Amino acid sequence: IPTTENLYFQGAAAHNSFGVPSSLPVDPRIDIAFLDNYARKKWEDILHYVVSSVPVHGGPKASVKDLLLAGRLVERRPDTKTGIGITQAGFTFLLQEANAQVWTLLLLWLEAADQAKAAAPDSIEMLSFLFMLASLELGRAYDTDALSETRRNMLPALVDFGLIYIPREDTRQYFPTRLATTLTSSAPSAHKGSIIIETNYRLYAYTSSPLQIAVLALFTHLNMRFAGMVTGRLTRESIRRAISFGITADQIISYLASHAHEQMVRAAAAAGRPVLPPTVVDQIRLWQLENE
């Protein structure tokens, strides 16, 4: 009998508390354009911290750093200068779209409270607040006074996820970002076509169409993953297979560079380093010249 829309509407109406709009005047400089930039800057920091753990050779709050660590997205390493190392889930997280990344962090946030509850704000209270936020209007100011004490205690973790914006000047108002409004919506991709090349010759990529799967298979040891995702390792055999298809090392390097991950390019450009690892790029050319 009941569909997805029926169960959602039932869970949303289940709790009588809803978003009260602030009767107080709104600062003109807090527009939909500002809130989009704010939410973007919050997530760019989270993503930069994840990109920081990628092997080569001022950060988000403890509320974010710990959830990524406990969520096995980034493992603790006692050898690195940064003291952290990226996992398989970490690279998957990087290729995920904006909405999916928020739900990775949200579901882990819900999981952390129940684990702290079992050892002794619970899941029911947290979910109900997320359900309310999804029904809010983007750009509109809402009364913080109207929120319950438990819901008020959730705001610092929710601002850390770039879902809510509370001005330093007026704590009486809370602004939901585009991430809050569109949270449970859809009832122009961000990382489709991207390729991630590691220092250990490993590949992580989200193919645009099966044409890219066929293209990557010419020079990489592929293995199909969920949706358009593919994973593999660059070997002498795979690189020399490309030679038999008329693909040169120069064409391989130029393809991996042009199709590189947005955030990984950003971190490389901000430092004094090229996107693709130089050690790998030299080995791509060597294998193509290693013939008889």
Short mmCIF file of C-alpha atoms in Angstrom, two decimals:
data_model
loop_
_atom_site.label_atom_id
_atom_site.label_comp_id
_atom_site.label_asym_id
_atom_site.label_seq_id
_atom_site.Cartn_x
_atom_site.Cartn_y
_atom_site.Cartn_z
CA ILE A 1 0.00 0.00 0.00
CA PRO A 2 2.48 2.85 0.93
CA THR A 3 5.03 4.44 -1.44
CA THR A 4 8.29 6.36 -0.62
CA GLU A 5 6.37 9.73 -0.71
CA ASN A 6 3.76 8.31 1.74
CA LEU A 7 6.38 7.14 4.32
CA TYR A 8 8.28 10.48 4.04
CA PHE A 9 5.13 12.67 4.53
CA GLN A 10 4.21 10.40 7.52
CA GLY A 11 7.66 10.85 9.17
CA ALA A 12 7.68 14.63 8.49
CA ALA A 13 4.17 15.24 9.96
CA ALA A 14 4.91 12.80 12.91
CA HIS A 15 6.53 15.67 14.89
CA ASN A 16 4.42 18.85 15.36
CA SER A 17 7.48 21.20 15.62
CA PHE A 18 8.20 23.16 12.37
CA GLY A 19 10.38 26.02 11.05
CA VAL A 20 9.14 29.37 12.37
CA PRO A 21 10.14 32.39 10.19
CA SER A 22 11.86 35.29 12.02
CA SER A 23 9.62 38.39 12.51
CA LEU A 24 12.87 40.45 12.89
CA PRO A 25 14.31 42.35 9.85
CA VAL A 26 16.91 40.58 7.67
CA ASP A 27 20.41 41.92 6.83
CA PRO A 28 20.40 42.64 3.03
CA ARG A 29 23.94 41.23 2.63
CA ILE A 30 22.61 37.70 3.57
CA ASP A 31 21.25 36.74 0.10
CA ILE A 32 20.86 33.34 -1.73
CA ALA A 33 24.19 34.12 -3.55
CA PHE A 34 26.05 34.57 -0.18
CA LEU A 35 24.55 31.39 1.39
CA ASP A 36 25.61 29.38 -1.74
CA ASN A 37 29.22 30.71 -1.39
CA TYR A 38 29.18 30.03 2.41
CA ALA A 39 27.98 26.39 1.90
CA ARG A 40 30.58 25.96 -0.91
CA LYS A 41 33.45 27.28 1.32
CA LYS A 42 32.41 24.95 4.22
CA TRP A 43 32.51 21.86 1.95
CA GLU A 44 35.71 22.93 0.14
CA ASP A 45 37.50 22.81 3.58
CA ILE A 46 36.06 19.29 4.33
CA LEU A 47 37.14 18.10 0.83
CA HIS A 48 40.60 19.75 1.15
CA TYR A 49 41.16 17.85 4.47
CA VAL A 50 40.28 14.56 2.65
CA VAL A 51 42.61 15.50 -0.30
CA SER A 52 45.37 16.32 2.33
CA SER A 53 45.49 12.60 3.39
CA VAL A 54 46.28 11.42 -0.23
CA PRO A 55 49.93 10.13 -0.40
CA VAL A 56 52.35 12.51 -2.22
CA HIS A 57 55.90 11.28 -1.21
CA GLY A 58 43.35 25.96 9.02
CA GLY A 59 41.04 22.92 8.95
CA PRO A 60 37.44 21.76 9.61
CA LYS A 61 36.20 21.54 13.25
CA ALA A 62 36.43 18.38 15.49
CA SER A 63 32.72 17.68 14.62
CA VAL A 64 33.81 16.93 10.99
CA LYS A 65 37.43 15.60 11.46
CA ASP A 66 36.25 12.84 13.89
CA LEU A 67 33.25 11.68 11.76
CA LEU A 68 35.51 11.16 8.69
CA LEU A 69 37.99 9.17 10.87
CA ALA A 70 35.32 7.03 12.66
CA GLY A 71 33.45 6.58 9.35
CA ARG A 72 36.60 4.87 7.89
CA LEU A 73 36.73 7.56 5.13
CA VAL A 74 40.24 8.54 6.37
CA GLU A 75 42.41 6.22 8.57
CA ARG A 76 44.86 7.39 11.28
CA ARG A 77 48.52 7.00 10.17
CA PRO A 78 51.45 7.33 12.66
CA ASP A 79 54.12 7.85 9.91
CA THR A 80 52.80 10.92 7.91
CA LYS A 81 53.52 14.60 8.81
CA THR A 82 49.71 15.20 8.61
CA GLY A 83 49.13 12.02 10.70
CA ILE A 84 46.24 10.81 8.42
CA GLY A 85 45.80 8.57 5.35
CA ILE A 86 42.98 8.29 2.75
CA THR A 87 40.98 5.02 2.40
CA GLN A 88 39.03 3.33 -0.47
CA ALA A 89 35.83 5.02 0.90
CA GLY A 90 37.70 8.37 0.87
CA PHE A 91 38.24 8.29 -2.93
CA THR A 92 34.60 7.11 -3.39
CA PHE A 93 33.48 10.11 -1.24
CA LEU A 94 35.51 12.49 -3.51
CA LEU A 95 33.73 11.20 -6.67
CA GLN A 96 30.28 11.50 -4.96
CA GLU A 97 27.95 14.41 -5.87
CA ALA A 98 27.15 17.34 -3.46
CA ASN A 99 23.92 15.77 -1.92
CA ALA A 100 25.45 12.27 -1.39
CA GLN A 101 28.48 13.77 0.43
CA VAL A 102 26.11 15.52 2.91
CA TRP A 103 24.26 12.21 3.55
CA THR A 104 27.61 10.40 4.15
CA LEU A 105 28.37 12.93 6.96
CA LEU A 106 24.73 13.04 8.26
CA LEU A 107 24.25 9.24 8.62
CA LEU A 108 27.65 8.98 10.44
CA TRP A 109 26.56 11.88 12.75
CA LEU A 110 23.37 9.91 13.60
CA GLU A 111 25.48 6.71 14.15
CA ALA A 112 27.88 8.52 16.58
CA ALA A 113 25.09 9.60 18.96
CA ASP A 114 23.58 6.05 19.23
CA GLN A 115 27.06 4.60 19.97
CA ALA A 116 27.50 7.25 22.74
CA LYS A 117 23.91 6.40 23.93
CA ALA A 118 24.65 2.59 24.02
CA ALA A 119 27.88 3.25 26.03
CA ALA A 120 25.94 5.34 28.63
CA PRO A 121 20.44 14.28 21.46
CA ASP A 122 19.51 10.86 19.93
CA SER A 123 18.76 9.66 16.32
CA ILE A 124 14.95 10.34 16.57
CA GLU A 125 15.55 14.02 17.56
CA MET A 126 18.35 14.48 14.93
CA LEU A 127 16.34 12.94 12.00
CA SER A 128 13.19 14.99 12.91
CA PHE A 129 15.26 18.21 12.78
CA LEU A 130 16.71 17.21 9.34
CA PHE A 131 13.14 16.45 8.11
CA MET A 132 12.00 19.96 9.22
CA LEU A 133 15.03 21.67 7.58
CA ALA A 134 14.34 20.01 4.16
CA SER A 135 10.87 21.71 4.10
CA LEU A 136 12.39 25.21 4.72
CA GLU A 137 12.70 28.00 2.09
CA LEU A 138 16.23 28.94 0.88
CA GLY A 139 17.34 32.46 1.80
CA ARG A 140 14.53 32.95 4.36
CA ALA A 141 15.44 33.80 7.98
CA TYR A 142 14.03 31.61 10.76
CA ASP A 143 13.52 32.21 14.55
CA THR A 144 16.20 30.41 16.67
CA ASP A 145 14.06 31.10 19.82
CA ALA A 146 11.38 28.72 18.38
CA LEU A 147 13.85 25.77 18.39
CA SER A 148 13.84 23.29 21.32
CA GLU A 149 16.95 23.13 23.61
CA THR A 150 17.93 19.74 22.05
CA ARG A 151 17.57 21.26 18.51
CA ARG A 152 19.59 24.35 19.59
CA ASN A 153 22.40 21.99 20.76
CA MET A 154 22.50 20.41 17.23
CA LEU A 155 23.12 23.79 15.42
CA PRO A 156 26.99 23.86 15.98
CA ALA A 157 27.37 20.42 14.30
CA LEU A 158 24.85 21.44 11.56
CA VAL A 159 26.75 24.68 10.78
CA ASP A 160 29.92 22.48 10.50
CA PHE A 161 28.16 20.56 7.67
CA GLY A 162 27.34 23.85 5.88
CA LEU A 163 23.58 23.21 6.20
CA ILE A 164 22.75 26.21 8.48
CA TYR A 165 24.22 29.76 8.69
CA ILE A 166 23.96 31.79 11.91
CA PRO A 167 25.36 35.38 11.83
CA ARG A 168 27.97 36.41 14.46
CA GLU A 169 25.96 39.69 14.88
CA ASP A 170 22.46 38.14 15.38
CA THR A 171 22.17 34.58 16.85
CA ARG A 172 18.31 35.07 16.94
CA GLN A 173 18.16 34.13 13.20
CA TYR A 174 19.26 30.92 11.37
CA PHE A 175 19.51 30.67 7.56
CA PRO A 176 19.17 27.30 5.75
CA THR A 177 21.61 26.84 2.81
CA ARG A 178 20.83 25.18 -0.58
CA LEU A 179 22.16 21.90 1.01
CA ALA A 180 19.39 22.08 3.65
CA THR A 181 16.54 23.00 1.22
CA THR A 182 17.42 20.36 -1.49
CA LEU A 183 18.44 17.68 1.15
CA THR A 184 15.50 15.30 0.34
CA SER A 185 14.38 16.89 -3.00
CA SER A 186 14.44 15.44 -6.64
CA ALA A 187 11.16 13.59 -5.74
CA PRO A 188 24.54 18.77 -14.75
CA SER A 189 26.79 16.30 -12.77
CA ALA A 190 29.78 17.48 -10.63
CA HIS A 191 32.33 14.57 -10.83
CA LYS A 192 31.24 12.61 -13.99
CA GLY A 193 34.26 11.85 -16.21
CA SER A 194 36.85 12.50 -13.43
CA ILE A 195 39.96 10.27 -12.95
CA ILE A 196 42.13 10.03 -9.79
CA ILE A 197 45.75 8.77 -10.14
CA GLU A 198 47.62 7.78 -6.94
CA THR A 199 51.42 7.53 -6.28
CA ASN A 200 51.04 3.70 -5.96
CA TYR A 201 49.77 3.59 -9.63
CA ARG A 202 46.11 3.03 -8.46
CA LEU A 203 43.18 4.47 -10.47
CA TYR A 204 39.77 5.65 -9.18
CA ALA A 205 37.29 7.01 -11.76
CA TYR A 206 33.59 7.77 -12.33
CA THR A 207 32.91 7.15 -16.07
CA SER A 208 30.49 9.42 -17.99
CA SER A 209 29.36 6.58 -20.34
CA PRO A 210 30.61 2.96 -21.08
CA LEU A 211 32.75 4.60 -23.85
CA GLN A 212 35.11 5.84 -21.06
CA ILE A 213 35.21 2.26 -19.59
CA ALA A 214 36.38 1.05 -23.05
CA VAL A 215 38.90 3.98 -23.24
CA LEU A 216 40.38 3.29 -19.75
CA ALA A 217 40.61 -0.49 -20.46
CA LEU A 218 43.17 0.30 -23.26
CA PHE A 219 45.75 1.59 -20.72
CA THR A 220 44.53 0.38 -17.22
CA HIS A 221 43.87 -2.91 -15.34
CA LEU A 222 40.13 -2.14 -14.77
CA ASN A 223 37.50 -3.72 -12.47
CA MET A 224 33.86 -2.52 -12.62
CA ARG A 225 32.38 -0.83 -9.47
CA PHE A 226 28.84 0.53 -8.75
CA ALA A 227 27.07 2.90 -11.27
CA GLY A 228 29.71 4.40 -13.57
CA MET A 229 32.56 3.85 -11.09
CA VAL A 230 35.70 1.91 -12.11
CA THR A 231 38.91 1.04 -10.18
CA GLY A 232 42.30 -0.36 -11.18
CA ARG A 233 46.12 -0.24 -11.23
CA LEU A 234 48.52 1.07 -13.92
CA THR A 235 50.98 -1.68 -14.97
CA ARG A 236 53.70 -2.18 -17.64
CA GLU A 237 51.29 -4.63 -19.39
CA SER A 238 48.34 -2.14 -19.41
CA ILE A 239 50.51 0.77 -20.68
CA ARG A 240 52.02 -1.44 -23.46
CA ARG A 241 48.44 -2.58 -24.41
CA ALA A 242 47.75 1.13 -25.29
CA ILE A 243 50.73 0.98 -27.77
CA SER A 244 48.86 -1.81 -29.68
CA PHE A 245 45.85 0.61 -29.92
CA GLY A 246 47.91 3.62 -31.17
CA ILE A 247 47.76 5.45 -27.80
CA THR A 248 51.08 7.14 -26.82
CA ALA A 249 52.34 7.92 -23.23
CA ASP A 250 51.97 11.66 -24.10
CA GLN A 251 48.25 11.05 -25.00
CA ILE A 252 47.77 9.00 -21.76
CA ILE A 253 49.32 11.75 -19.50
CA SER A 254 47.34 14.53 -21.33
CA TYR A 255 44.07 12.52 -20.90
CA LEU A 256 44.59 11.85 -17.13
CA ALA A 257 45.54 15.56 -16.63
CA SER A 258 42.52 16.96 -18.61
CA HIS A 259 40.10 14.55 -16.81
CA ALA A 260 41.69 15.04 -13.30
CA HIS A 261 39.56 15.64 -10.11
CA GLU A 262 38.58 19.34 -9.49
CA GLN A 263 39.58 19.36 -5.74
CA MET A 264 42.83 17.40 -6.38
CA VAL A 265 43.87 19.94 -9.09
CA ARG A 266 43.07 22.79 -6.61
CA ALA A 267 45.30 21.36 -3.81
CA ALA A 268 48.16 20.69 -6.29
CA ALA A 269 47.97 24.22 -7.85
CA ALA A 270 47.82 25.82 -4.34
CA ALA A 271 51.07 23.95 -3.47
CA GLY A 272 54.17 23.79 -5.69
CA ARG A 273 53.20 20.50 -7.33
CA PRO A 274 51.64 19.21 -10.63
CA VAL A 275 48.27 17.31 -10.50
CA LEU A 276 49.60 13.90 -11.68
CA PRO A 277 52.50 12.41 -9.59
CA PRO A 278 55.81 13.08 -11.47
CA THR A 279 57.16 9.58 -10.50
CA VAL A 280 54.10 7.96 -12.22
CA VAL A 281 54.31 10.27 -15.34
CA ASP A 282 58.02 9.29 -15.84
CA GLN A 283 57.09 5.56 -15.48
CA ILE A 284 54.28 6.01 -18.11
CA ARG A 285 56.90 7.26 -20.65
CA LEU A 286 59.54 4.63 -19.63
CA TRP A 287 57.24 1.62 -20.27
CA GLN A 288 56.40 3.01 -23.75
CA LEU A 289 60.18 3.27 -24.49
CA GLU A 290 61.09 -0.09 -22.78
CA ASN A 291 60.52 -1.96 -26.14
CA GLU A 292 63.38 -4.28 -27.38
#
